């Protein structure tokens, strides 16, 4: 029906119109497809930012540093956003991307265990340095858009080296949208403590027929830019390709 040239032009325009540079890697089966207006970003390293929360959650749950029902109490100190000044579960913190909750979880895990677990799952360059509570925000941990879809691919198919239940627990925390029988599971990310700033939206679409299609949107964020563009560009691309 529609030509590859046309799909590539449309996706590229989604990034052009947002006035940013980015790429969206789609994985169908074992085949990777790169779309966007800056394809060379596919194999470049960037901090994972909040997308790391997926692995942070897997590690904490596997090593019993928390349960899926445990309420992390707000300590009462001012936080960057009012929505974060409340008591929440890992799952609510994932949806709100509440860094404080995941920094606490990382501290429970501890530097030694964290470095060992990141090495074991082979996430990005696997280096977390010496600060257990911010390595995914300002370095030294980095990962490429290609490694992100592959990580998303593994999780969606329960192939990561964690118990089946642990992966299922975390996957339930990532449902962000339902469209015509398709479910989108994803984690957004936005590293503001780095220059240039990087935006993410990694995950997968589960189609009605059960097929899972992983993706990874990666672009440069600019001050005065709405975080929802990550989602809007992802949805329009997924739709344009007929994925959802």
How many CA within 13 A on the CB side of residue 175?
A: 8
Q: Is 13 a catalytic residue?
A: no
Angle at 168 between CA 165 and CA 170, to 5 degrees: 110
Q: Are 240 and 89 in contact (CB under 8 A)?
A: no
Hey, what are 213's tokens? 């299609």
Choose, from 4, 33, 50, 188, the residue flagged as catalytic. 50
Looking at the DSSP bridge assignments, the partners of residue 221 are 197
Three-state secondary structure call for residue 214:
strand
Q: What are phi and psi of 127, to 5 degrees?
A: -105, 120
CA atoms within 13 Å, Cβ hemisphere of 152: 35
Report DSSP letters for 157-213, one per residue: TT-SSS-HHHHHHHHHTTEEEEETTEEEEEEEEEE-SSSSEEEEEEEEEE-TTS-EE
Give the active site residues.
50
């Amino acid at each position: 029906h529609i030509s590859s040239q046309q799909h590539e032009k449309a996706i590229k325009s989604y990034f052009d119109e947002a006035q940013t540079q980015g790429v969206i890697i789609i994985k169908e089966g074992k085949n990777l497809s790169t779309y966007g207006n800056a394809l060379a970003r596919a194999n470049k390293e960037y901090v994972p930012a909040s997308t790391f929360k997926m692995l942070n959650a897997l590690i904490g749950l596997e090593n019993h540093k928390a349960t899926t029902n445990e309420i992390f109490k707000w300590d009462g100190k001012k936080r960057t956003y009012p929505m974060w000044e409340k008591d929440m579960t890992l799952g609510e913190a994932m949806a709100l991307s509440a860094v404080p909750v995941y920094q606490e979880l990382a501290r429970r895990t501890g530097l030694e265990l964290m470095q060992k677990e990141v090495k074991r799952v082979n996430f990005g360059n696997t280096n977390i340095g010496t600060q257990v509570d911010n390595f995914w925000l300002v370095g030294p941990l980095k990962i490429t858009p290609v490694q992100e879809v592959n990580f998303a691919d593994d999780l969606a198919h329960n192939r990561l080296p964690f118990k089946l239940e642990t992966q299922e627990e975390v996957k339930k925390m990532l449902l962000i949208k339902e469209v015509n029988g398709s479910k989108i599971y994803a984690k957004s990310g936005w590293g503001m403590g780095v220059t240039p700033q990087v935006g993410w939206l990694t995950g997968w679409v589960e189609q009605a027929n059960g097929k899972k299609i992983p993706f990874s949107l990666n672009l440069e964020m600019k001050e005065g830019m709405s975080g929802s563009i990550r989602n809007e560009i992802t949805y329009k691309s997924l739709e344009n390709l007929g994925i959802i």
